[model samples]
Each structure stands twice: as C-alpha cells, then as structure tokens.
Target chain A: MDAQSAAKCLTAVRRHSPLVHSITNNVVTNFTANGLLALGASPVMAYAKEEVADMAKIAGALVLNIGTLSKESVEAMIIAGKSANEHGVPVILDPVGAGATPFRTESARDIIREVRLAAIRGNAAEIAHTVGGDIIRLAQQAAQKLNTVIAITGEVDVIADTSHVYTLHNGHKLLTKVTGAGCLLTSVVGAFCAVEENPLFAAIAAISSYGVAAQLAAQQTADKGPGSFQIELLNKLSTVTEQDVQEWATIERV
Target chain B: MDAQSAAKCLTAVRRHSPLVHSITNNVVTNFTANGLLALGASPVMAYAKEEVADMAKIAGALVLNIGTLSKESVEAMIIAGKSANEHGVPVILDPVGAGATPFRTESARDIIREVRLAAIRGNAAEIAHTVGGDIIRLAQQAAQKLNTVIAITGEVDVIADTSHVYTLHNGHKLLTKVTGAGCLLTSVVGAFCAVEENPLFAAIAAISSYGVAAQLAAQQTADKGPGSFQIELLNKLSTVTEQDVQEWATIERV
Candidate 1:
C-alpha cells in the first residue's frame, strides 16, 4: 500500500469512530483503551460470558488478546468471536507471549480453530509458536492456513495475506521499552479493519500509521525515558494528522 | 503521620524493593505494575487459581483490586488473599466501583468477609457502599467496623484508623483525569505496607509520597494532557526524593 492509501484509511477511522470491542489482557487494557480513544475510535472492553456475545455483536470490530489468559477469558473470546462472525463484524487476534508457555500456545490455536478471524498480529516468536516456520514464510503460511491476514511486528513489521506480503519500517526502538505496545497495535488494527473492507490493506495501513506515530513521539521525547515516551506516544496518536501519516509512513510491497 | 516518618517509609520501600503480588483489574494492570516499579517496588500479577495462592504467599504484600470484576477474578482474589493471610503477608484491598453495580458491591463485601485485609482503600462512595455514611465519618466507621485501616482518596486524601483521622492535601486535579491513578495508588499503598508495620502509617506515607510525585509531574507537564501527566508521574515516582516528600507533604490530624 502507498502512503496515500494508508493516510486515507486513518482519515476514515477518525471520521467513522467505530466502536471496537476488546477482550484484552490484564496488563494493557488502560493503554489500549486510551490509544483507541486518541485515534478517534470508541473502545469497549467486555469479558464476562454473559455480556461478551452481546457486546461483540454491536461493535464495529472485535479484538481478542491473550497476554494474560484464563479459562474464563478464553471461553468468553470464543463466544464473542462467534457472535462477531454472525453479525458480519471482523475479528482481530493478538497472540501475546504465545511462545512463552504451553497454555498460551494452545489457547491461541484453539481460538484460531473455533473462530473465523479477519487478521492475527504478533511478534516473530509468537507467530512461529502459533504456526511454526521461517519469518516471512511463517507469516504467509499462517495467513493461508488460518484464512486470515498475519501481521508480525518487530524492528521492521511484516504483513502477509494469502496472496501477498508487505513490510513497514517506521517505528522507534523506544516502543520496545513500554509494555503493551504490541497489544495496543493489535487493537488499532481492529479499528482500521472496522473502517476498511480488505483485511490486508487494513493491516498495512494500521501498522504504517502506528509506526509513524511512534517515530513522531520518539522525536518529541529524545532525551526522556520510556515513561515520557509512552505519554508523548499517546499525544501523537491523538494529534497526528493525515498529512503526517502520508509524509512519514514507510510501507513497501515485497 | 509526620513528614519525617512518611519520608522514612518511602526510603524503606526503596531500600527493600519489596515484592508485591497484585490480582488487580484488567484496565490498570500495566499502569499499576509500572507505578510499583517506578516507586522502587517489584510487581507481579498472577490470577490463575493454580498459582495465585503460591504467588501471594511469598509476596511482601498482596493487593486485590476489583475494578473489572468477574466470577473468575473474584474467586482468584479470595484465594490469593487467604494465602497472603496464612503466610503473614499484609493484604490491601481496593473496592473499585463497588456502589456502581450490585455484583461489584457484593463481591467486595464477600472478599472482606472471607479474607483478612490489613487495609481497604477506596473513594468516599466506594467505602460508603462497602460499609454504609458521610465522608470522614464513613471512613472512620469503615476502619473500626472492618478492623482495618480505611483510606478515602480524592481532592484531599483521608486516612482513618479506629481512633485517628488524617487528611492530606498534596495531589493535583490532573490525577483524576488519569484512568488508573487510583488503582496505582492502591498498589503503591501495598508497597508501603510491605515495609511499614502500621497499616495506617503505611497508607499515610504512600498517599503523601504519591501526591508529592503527582504534584511534581503536574508541574513538569502543566500544559500537557493526562497522558503526559501520567508518564511524568512515573518519572517523578522513580526520582522523587525523601527531601521532596518532607518538604511538600501537607498532613493535618482531624
């Protein structure tokens, strides 16, 4: 995707202000909500089995994250995912720390098998643990096998769908210092997916804009620590304009 | 509590770097962990039924926050609180949004009835919902009725024991704009309780020091939003000296 297309997607997200339902982890819920708000998207977090299906059905998109998992949460995610599917709302999955434990890996796989997700986002290690293979090839194989878009975020982010692959290079290393950056990114992808029709383009635009925001935040807090970086990152997420995204987003097809 | 005593508690927390186990809500987990880490305390979050008890038993203090409650989370909190009591570990409870929902109020009361809490911290409405009165009288009554120190935090933070009530005026308005500031404060109180023998004194010191840090952070980010204040708050928490707390803390016995 070109910078113009990416910028357009961000504008659409701001104009639509889609309600995104998130069943995220314990650690990043506040940050994730704030990030979505700053980007002009309404965020709702509901995890109870009683309410997850109802919440997901009404939302523009549904996001599931397993950073800190429990049996109840996993069950709720499936229930919500099915509701989203029946309502024609897209679902995005974030398999955080999937490679770190057997339970995490199995939980991610179970969600994939039970739910029809529009996209899945994770780091190289987490994606490898979920699907098993080399970096770019692993993402492609996982996307094709799961019938979903795959986004592997690192120094250089990689997005792969069944037929094509793309890479984005725009984020700063300081993004690594703060916890839940990846989790927030996954939710942001859901926001973009809510506004865009194609999952592949939505993932590309989301990653590029997120990277651009990080770069701008880093420049503003060059001498500050992670705490300062994180706060400024939120500010940039809210204030970054479509012109900024068009100028700063670095995405290329591979 | 005097400034010198409060400063000493802050110093002790820094020197000991006590391990604090938190079974907190999803919204503020990252902020709470970062706040604890910034204040020179180690934070660990475990919620699984299989491990919460084990983690709580070894921690210097256990924090239970019921901000986003579910059947699973409430169960885990009780299991962890009981283990903390059995191991002689101090337990701190934050009855977040207790009055908003019947489930929340009952869950907070259930935990209080089942677990031995050293201290319970919440806003005036939350404390009143938990015990049932006016502001200062409610705090005092809750403290005596529950047999635990009660802290009511707001424009002016009030700490009450069976006999004494203290009001502290040091925090800024921006603290209210931050989503998890209260939750982080509860965890910071847990850190102070990890080192201080008296729960009342511990809550007082934690509130004063936290307010001082918030004041400093606000000064640094006067023109910025809650996001900037939150980041600076963390930086100030890590850097705020004993002298700063002694010089800035305003505490009066009521």
Candidate 2:
C-alpha cells in the first residue's frame, strides 16, 4: 500500500471509532486500552470464558494476547475467536512472549490452529520461534500456512501476506524501552483492521501510524527517560493525522 | 499518622527496596509494576497456581487485584494469599470494581476471608461494598474485624484502623483521569507495608507519598492531558522526596 492509502485507513479509523475487544495480558491492559483510546478506537477487555464470546461477536475486531497466559484464558481466547469467525469480525493475535516459555509457545501455536486469524503480530524473537526461520521467508511461510497476514515488529517492522511483503522503518529505539510497546502496537493493528477491509493495508497503516507516533514521542521526550516518553506516545497517538502519516511514513513494498 | 512519620516510611521504602509480589488484573499490571519500580520497590507478578506459593513465600508483600476476574485466576489468588499468610509476608488487596458485579464482590470477600490481609485498598465505592455501610464507619469496623487497615481512597482518602481514623487531602483531580491511578496506589501501599512494621503507618505513608507524586505530576502536565500526566506521575513517584512530602502532605487525625 502507498502512503496515501495508508493515511486513508487511519482516517477511516478516526471516522468509524470501531470497538476492539481485547483478551490481553494483565501487564499491558491499561496501556493497550489507553493506546487504542488515544488512536480513536474504542477498547473493551472481557476475558471471562462465559462472556468473551458475546463481546467478541459484537466487536469490530478481536485482539488476543498471551503475555500473561493461563489455562482458562487460553480457552476463553478460542471461544472468542470462534465467535468472531462466525460473526465475520477480524481477529488480531499478539503472541507476546511466544518463545519465552513452552507454555507460551504451545498456546500461540494452538491459537493459530484454532482461530481464523486475520493477522499475527509479534517481535522478531517471538515470530521467529513460531514460524521457525528468517524474518521475511518465515513470516511469508507462516502467512501462507495460516492464510493470515504476519507482522514481525522491532527496530524495523516486517509485514507479509501470501502475495506481498513490506518493510517499514519509521519507529525509534525508545519504543523498545517502554514495556507493552509491542502489545499496544498489536492493538493498533487491530484498530486498523477493524476499520479497513484489506488486512495488508490495515497492518501497514497501523505500523506506520504507531511508528510515527513513537518517533514524535521520542522527539518530545528527548533527554527525558522512558517514563516521560511513554506518556507523550499516548498523546501523539490521539493527535496523529493523515497529514502526519502522509509526510512521515516510510513504507517500502518488497 | 503525622506527616513526619509518613515521610520516614517513604525513606524506608527507598532504603529497603522491598519486593512486592502481585497477582493483579490484566488492566493495570504494567502500570502497577512501573509505579512500584519508580517508588524504589521491586515487583514480581506470578499467577500460575503452581508457582505462586513459592513466589509469595519469598516476597515482602503480596498484592491481589480482581479487575479482570476468571475462575482460575480467583483460585490462583487464594493459593498465593494462603502461601503469603504462611510465610508471614504482608498481603495488600486492591478490590478493583468490587461492587460492579456479584463475581467481583464475592471474590473480594472470599480473598479477605481466606487471606490474613495487611491492608485493603480501593476507592470509596469499591471499599464500601467489600466491608458494608457508611464509608468511614464501615471502613473502621471492617479494619477491627479483619485486623487489617482499610484505605478508602477518593478526592479525600480515608484511612482507618480500629482506633485511629485519618483523612488525607493531598491528591489532584487529574488522578481520576488516569486508568491505573488506584491500582498503582495499591501497589505503592504494598511497598510501604513491606518496610513499616505498623500497617497503619504504612498505609498513611503510601497514601501521602502517592498523593504528593500525583500533585507534582499534575502541576507539570498542566494544560496537557491525562496522557502526559500519567508519565509525569511515574517520574514523580521516583523523584518525590521526604521534603516534598513534609511540605505537601495534608493528613488530619479525626
């Protein structure tokens, strides 16, 4: 997707105000919610096995994060994913700490098999473990196998589907300094997916928007530490516009 | 609890760097951890029922939050709470959304009954449901019954044990704007409780320190929104001194 198309997807998110249901980790729930709210998407976190299905079915997108995993929460994610599938809502999976533990890795694998994922987002280490190789080739293989877009985000973000691959170099090092930066980014992708039809366009728009916001936040909090940088990041997410995206995004089609 | 004594508790937290173990909700886990770290306390969040016993046994304090409750997580909190009790570790409870649902209210009650709580911290609405009637009267009664200090925090924070009732008027309105303000406050209380022998003194110290930090953050983020205010809060948590507390704390014995 070109910069203009990516910018348009962000505009669509602002106009639609789509509800994104997240069954995310305890560590990043507040940050993820605040980040989504800042970015013009409504955030709802419902993790109960009994209620997740209902919440998932009505939301514009379903976000599943396994940052702090439990046996029951994994079950809830499956139930929510199936309901989202039947309802035709997009599902974004954030395999947080995918390779960090056997439990996390197995849970990520299980979710991918059980859910009809619209996109799978994680860091290089996480996606590398799940897919088992280099960033682009492994991501492409995983996308084909799952029939979902894969986003491997780090210093630079690599996003791929069956047909295309894009590399985005817009984020800053300070993104990694803050905890939950990646989890919040996954939600940003979910927000974009909620408003845009094409998963590829959605991922690109979300990554670029998030990257630009981080860059702006870094600039604003220069000489200040991660604590100050994190707050400014939220401010930038709410205020970043199509004009900012068009001017700042550095997305390259490969 | 006088301002001078409260200032000493803050100093003890910085000197001791107490380890606070939290099995908190998904919404504010990240913020709670960061806030504790900023206050010169160590934080460990372990929720697996299998390992919580070991984790709770070693921690200076254990914090249990029921913001995003599940059947398994509730069970995990009980297991951890019992372990903390056995190990002589102080336990702090943040009954987030205690009155919002039957599940939340019952779970908070169950934990209180099951655990030998050092302190119970929540907003007025939350603490009211957990204990029973009028804010101040019920909080004092519950403290006497539970043998624990109950902190009912709001615009004016009411902290009571059986004999002594103190009201603190130091926090700013901007605190309500941040999602994890109360959750973070509970963890801060845990930090103080870890170091101070008297739970009442610990509760007073934590409340005053947190309020002072919020006040400082609000001043810095004036004209900016909640986003900036939250970051400054974390920064101030780390930097707010004994001098700041002596000058800013407004604690009254009633």
Candidate 3:
C-alpha cells in the first residue's frame, strides 16, 4: 500500500463525513456513535430486522458490532450486511472479546462465513481467537480465504489483509482504560473506508490516526486516570489536525 | 406461593449476592448494572453469542432486556440463552416497549418462542400483546405458565407462576418518568432469582424492594420534581435497608 494514497484517505474522510449504521452491543453503542460523530462522520444506531436492510442500503458504510447478541439482531445483520454489500457499501466487524467463550467465538466464525465483510476489527485476544490458532500453532488461518482486513488491536496493533499483515505502533497505554475506545476506533475506520476505496490503506490510516490521537490525549492528561483520559480522548478526536497525523504515526508492513 | 416465603426469599437476596448476566438495551446498560450492584449483585454485560454461552454458563441468572434491540444482538441472546437453559441458569426476559412497533413486537415474540425463559417480564400493554390476551386475560393466563414466572409491571405488578397470581401494588408514579427504572427492576429481580432457589419468591421480593425504595425516595422529595426525583431515587436505592422493604410493601398472593 502506498503512503501517499493512505494519507489522502484520511483527508477524504474528514471532508466527506460518511454515514455509518452500527448494530452493536448496548453498552458501547452511544460511545461508538459519539466517537464517530467526533471524527466528522454521521453515526446512526439502527437495527430492527424490518428496517436494517433499508438502513444499510443508504449508509456509506455499515458496521456490525456484536457486543449484545440475540437471534433477531443476527438476522438483521445478515440482511443488512448483504444489502450493504450489494450497494457497494463497505461493512466492518468489531468482534469484541470473541474467544472468552463459546457463543461469541462461534458467532464470530458464523458471521465471517455468512457475510462478505470489508474488514473485521477486535482486540488482540479477540482477533487472535477469531483468526484461529492456539498460542503456538495459530497462524490466523481463518483470515486466509476472505479478503477482509483483520485488525488485532493491542500494545502494537496488527492489521492483516488476505496477503500481508501490518503492525502499527502509535498510541498510548491509557487508551485501553476508557470503555469502548477500542470499539469506537472501528467506527472511525468505517468512516475512512466509506470515503476511500482502498480499505486496507483506510484501515491503516484510521488506526494510526487513532493511536496518535490517543498519545496526544494521554500526554495532555498523563497524570490523570481513565475518567480524565476518556474526556481527553474525545477532545483529541475532535481536535486532531492533519499535521498531527503526519508527524506522530509509525506504521509498517509485517 | 406463600407471602412469608416470598419475603424470606427477598431477605436472602442482598444477604447473598448473586452474579447476573444481562443482555440489555444501550439506554439502560449503566443504570441496570449500577442498580444490581447497589442491591448486592454482580452484573456482567456480555452479549457475544459465543461468550454469552460461556458467561451464561457461569452466571447465577441471565436477563434479556430488549428495550433497544437490533438483528445481531437478538441472535446473540438466543445463542446465549439456549446455553443458559442447557446449563440450568435461570433465564428472564424483559420485552421493553414490545407493542410500540411491529419490529419490536415480532422480535419479542420470536425471543419467547426460541428461549426457554425461567421468567418473562414486561409492562401491562407489552405483556398483554405478547402473551396474546387482553390485560385481564393476560394476568389470568400468566398463571397457566407454571414452569416460569411471568411478571407484568404497571399500575400494579403481577407475578404469576402456574398455581396462583400475585399482584403487587406498591411503587411511585414518578418511576414512569425515569427511562431505565423498569429495566433496573428487571435486573434486580434477576439478582434475587440468582440467590434464591425460588424465582417466584424473587419476583415478589424485587417488587416490594423496588416499590418501597421508590416510595421512600418520592416521599422525602415531594417538593422536588423529576430531576430531583431521579437523584433521590438513586439515593434511596443506596439508602434502602431490609426494614424499609418490610415496612412500606403492599403485596398480596391469590
């Protein structure tokens, strides 16, 4: 992926501010929407099986976050995801905390098999489990068949497309403490993907931009704890400049 | 069900804290969790189908609150709930605002048909519509479902578990104004059911406790309006003791 194209994607997202439809867990829905709105994107929390397909058709991008799972919501996501896919709207997945148990792990596996996702994002433990592999032999085989960008967010964020993987080092330790900051990052990337054609580049730029913003927020309130860090994180999302993105990030192909 | 046995069950809840897993709405996630915590319960919000199965396996009880729902969350609930049934964890359903729209109404119906809930809770209107009866008939038929407790909360609360129906007439009008109070009550009942072997008794206890707490809060802040009522409600929850529960409750068994 070319850096020039990647940087251009960020500029495009800021100018366009695409609409993203999120069907996520109840806990993080507001935080995810607010974060997307802060980053110059329209966020709509709509997911009724009856309305989701229609909602997805109109959105520039659709993200399926399964923090709160139910039978109807799954049908809505599949219907919506297919609609989004048909409309050429990129769909992203944040399979938050996937491997902690059986239902989540199987659900994540099922959704990937069912939908043609543009990307799937989660924590390292979540992503690692989603991609398949034990601590030793888990070479992330599940990511091979699909062209979805699989992101494993942790100390250093790891991003993979079908062919290559990129490990990005940019953000702070404190960002983890704020609830759903990791999930919000997926929505931000969805906005970037909507505006830019190359989602792989868009994914990298979004992660890098988020990381840099976190470091900025953290540096301003380093002495404070998670509560202060949360406020500062929102503040930084709104306040991040194009100049900040160029100077702060260090993303490389793995 | 004996009133004294129900009272005994209520007393046992706070004395023996229980773990409750909630797959609930975004509007009430924090409120529900806090309410459960205040009443001496542990709250875990896990909605991933895979993890929910895992979470449900460990939780004392599971609560499905679809105040705000989507396609994906519903599937997760089903997966998790079926697992909960398999593992013998008591399951509860709160079909919030079920009759408000077709999407919500049908979704609620789908949930009941799919999950073998230990208890199903909702408002008078929602329960009547979902249970396929007029409000009065709904109350009567609730008594037919012996395997589970059907709790209808409105001007009064009806706790029907096959043999007999118990109606509780104790609470504040202001609770209607609060957004998450109903959801919180459902969560409180989940906590009580988790600790007490008899969920029928747990329902009676939660109502008495919740009603009395609202009454005390409303009494002290008679001069204050909704905003003050909100804070006072929370304050009273913190302030409520077992004595308070015994003093103001007006519960009767039929």
Candidate 4:
C-alpha cells in the first residue's frame, strides 16, 4: 500500500473505535493491551473457555497468540476463534515461538487447519518451523487457499494475499531488547485490522507503524536503554499521528 | 489512620516487601500492578485455577476481583482465597460490577462466605448488593462490622467499618472517565493492608492518599483527557511527598 492510503488507515482506526480481543500469552498480555489503548484501540482479553465466545462476538478483531500456551488457554482460543469467525470479525494469528516444542507446533498447526485465519504473523524461524510454512509457503497459501493475508515479520516484514504480496522494510533494534516487543506488535496488527478493510494493507500498516515508532522512540530516549523504550513506545502510540505514519512506512509489492 | 501512622505503614510496605496476588479482569491488571509497585508491593496475577492455591500461599496478600468473573476464574478465587486464609495472609475482595449480573453477585457472596476476608471494596451499589445487605442495611450495620470495610466509591466516598462508618469527602469526576480506575484503587488498598496492623486504618490511608493523587493528577492534566490522567497518576504516586499526604487528606474517623 502507498503512504496516503496507509495514513488513511491510521486515522480511520481512531475514528472507528475498534475493539480487539487478544488471547495472548501471559507475559505480554499487559503490554499488548496497553499499547493497543495508546494507539486509540480498545482491547479486551477474554481467556476463559466460556467467556471467549462472548468476548469474541463483540470485538472487531481477534488475535490468537500462543507464546505461552496451556491446555485450557488453547481450548479458550478455539472457542473464541470459532465465535469470532461466526461473527465475521478478522482473526490474526501470532504463531509465537512455535517451534520451541512439539506441543506448540502441533497447536499452531491445529489452529491453522481449523480456523479461517485473516492473517498468520510470526518470526522467520517460528513461522518456518510452525508448519514448515516459511515466508514463501505462507505467502502462496494466503494468496490461494486461506483467502487472507499472511505476515511473516523479520528484518523485512512480509504481507501476502491471494492475489499479491508485499514486503515492508522498517524497524529498529531497540525493540529486540524489550520482552513482548514482538507480541505487542501483533496487537497493533489487530488494531489496524479492526479499521482497514483490506487485510494485507492492514497487516502492512500495523508493522510499519510499529517500526516507525520504534525508531523514533529509540532516538528520543537515546541513552536510556530498554526501560525508556517501554514508556516511550506507549507515549509514541498516543503521539504518532497520520502525518508520522505517512512519512515513515516502507512497503513494496512483490 | 493519622498522617504519621500512615507514613509509617508506607515504610513498612516498602521495608517488608509483601507479594500481592491478583485474580482480576484484563482492563486494570497493568495499572493495578504499577500502583502496587509505586507503593512498594509485589503484584502478581495468578489466573489459572490449578495453580491459584500454590501461588497464593507464597504471597502475603490475595486480592480477589470479580471484574471479569468466569467459571475458571471463580474456581481460582476460591482455591486461592482458602489458601491465603490458611496461610494467615489477608484476602481483599474487589467485587467489581456486582449489580451487573447474577453470576457476579453469586461469586462475590461465595468469596465473602468462604474466605477470611479482611476487606471488600466497590462502589455503593456493588457493596450494598453483596452481603444480602441493602444500602440502608449496610448504612445501619456499617459502623459495627470490623470483619471487612465496605467502601462505596463515587461522587462521595464512604468507608464503613463494623464500629465506625465515615465519609471521605474528596476526589474528582475525572476518575470515572479513566478506565482501570477502581481496579487500581483496589490494588492500592492491597499495598496498604500488606503492611498495616489495622486493616481498617490501612484502607482509609490508601483511599486518602489515592484521593489526593487523583486531585493532583486532575490538576496536572487540566488541559488533556484520561490519557494525561493516566501518566500524572503514576507520577503523583511515585513523587507524592510525606508532607503532601499530611496537608491534603480530609479523612475522618467515626
């Protein structure tokens, strides 16, 4: 997507007041929700097996993250995901640390097979190992079968739809030092997805927005290290306007 | 509690370093934990039913919040509350949205009856509905029940102990607009009770200190919205001097 279109999506997000449901890992749930709030998105975390269905129905988008998966939490994700599908809300999967163990890979695969994902986002290694569906396979699958966007985030964040593919090159290394940095980015995707109609463009916009914020936050709090980055990231989420978004995002159709 | 006494308890909280377990909804977990951190208390959210008992025993205080009550969460609260009572630590309940649903009311009653609660706090409507105790009955029984302090918060805040019920005529409406507010206040109370010899006095001090901070935060963010209140609240919590508490608080003991 181009800069003007990307900027429109950013403004549209605040205007729409979209609610994103995150069934994320324990470590990043707090950070993820707060970041979404900072960006003018409403976040609801409904993790219980019973209420996820209720929570999913109301939310505009659903994010299923398995960074810290457990048996019950997994069940809750399925319930929420299915409900979210029935409600016609977008679903973004962050296959976080998918290959760390067999259970995680199996769960990620199970989710991929069962749910109609709007997008599957993950790191190069985790996504590669998730279903042995690296960037290329994910790109091809999203373009054809899933009828959705697949975002493989790395040095270059990739967004692929059934008809097209795009790579976005924008980010900062300061993000790496912080725990839940990547997981929080997935929620940003959820935020943008709640607004943008085109799932691929939404995926591209969220990653670029986060990437730009990271660079700016890194500069503003130069000597402060990761501690300042945490606070600065939240502040920037509130501060970054459409103008900032238009200026910094880098995207290319592949 | 007097300014001098409350200040001493603040020191005790910092010096003793108590761990507080929270079983709450998603909205306020981050703010609640940060409030505890500023007041020198360790905040932990133990959500799983199977692990609640084990986690609560190690912590000094357990906070049971029904803000996001579900089947699993209710079970966890019971397990943790009993463990906390058995281990001799205080269990504080924040019966958030008690009047909103039958499920919430039943869960609150379950905690009050099953657990050895030191305090139960909520707005007037919530507290009144919890004990089969109407607002008027609570007003009559208010001055005599020392088992727990029922705090009815809003335009006018009321803290009713068994033998004494007094009004804290402070605070502003900005507090209502901000999200995660009551939840954070509940956590602040936990920080105070963690170190205070008298749970009643501790609850009073916490609300007193919190009211002053809210007033100050409102003033600081006069030009902004709830976003500004969010930051200023933390800044005030971290920097509110010993003198500020003494000069600003208008609390009375019945």
Give a tens-digit lDDT track for model 2, residues A1-254.
87888899988998999999998877788888888877878777879985678778889999999988999889999999999999999999988888899999999989988889999898777876766236778778878877889998767778999889998889889877888888988888999999888998899999998888888888989998988888889888877778888898999988
Lowest summed-lDDT stretch of 10 residues in model 2 chain B?
B130-139
Judging by DockQ against the true structure, name the best candidate.
2
Tell me the tens digit of each residue's lDDT in model 4 across A83-149.
9899998898988778889999889988887788888888766666664236766766645765767
| TM-score to true structure, per model | 0.67, 0.68, 0.58, 0.79
Over B1-254, each residue of candidate 1 has an lDDT whose tens digit, in order, gives 79889999999999999999888876788888878877888877878775578778889999999988999889999999999999999999999998999999999999989998889998888898887136788888888998899999778878899989998898998988898898999999999999999999999999999999999999999897887888899888878999999999998888
At residue A129, candidate 3 shows an lDDT of: 65
Ranking under lDDT, best-scoring first? 1, 2, 4, 3
Count of clashing residue pairs in every prediction: 0, 1, 23, 7
> What lDDT does model 3 reach?
0.77
Task: Score chain A of model 4 by TM-score against the reference chain A.
Answer: 0.94
Can you write out model 1's per-residue Cα lDDT over A26-67, one digit (the tens) per residue?
778888999999999999998999999999999999999986
How would the docking of model 1 be graded?
A: incorrect
In the predicted model 4, the residue pairs found to clash are A143-A161, A143-A162, B143-B162, B143-B163, B144-B162, B144-B163, B145-B162
Q: Whole-model Cα lDDT per candidate? A: 0.89, 0.87, 0.77, 0.77
Interface Cα RMSD for all candidates? 2.9, 2.7, 6.8, 3.9
Which regions of candidate 4 fall more than 4 Å away from where they truly are? A124-138, B1-37, B41-61, B66-73, B79-90, B96-106, B123-148, B152-184, B194-201, B211-239, B250-254
Q: With candidate 2 superimposed using the best TM-score fit, by how many Å does residue B210's alpha carbon deviate from the native?
A: 0.8
For all candidates in order, state the fraction of native interface contacts they contain: 0.31, 0.42, 0.35, 0.09
lDDT of 2 at B89: 95
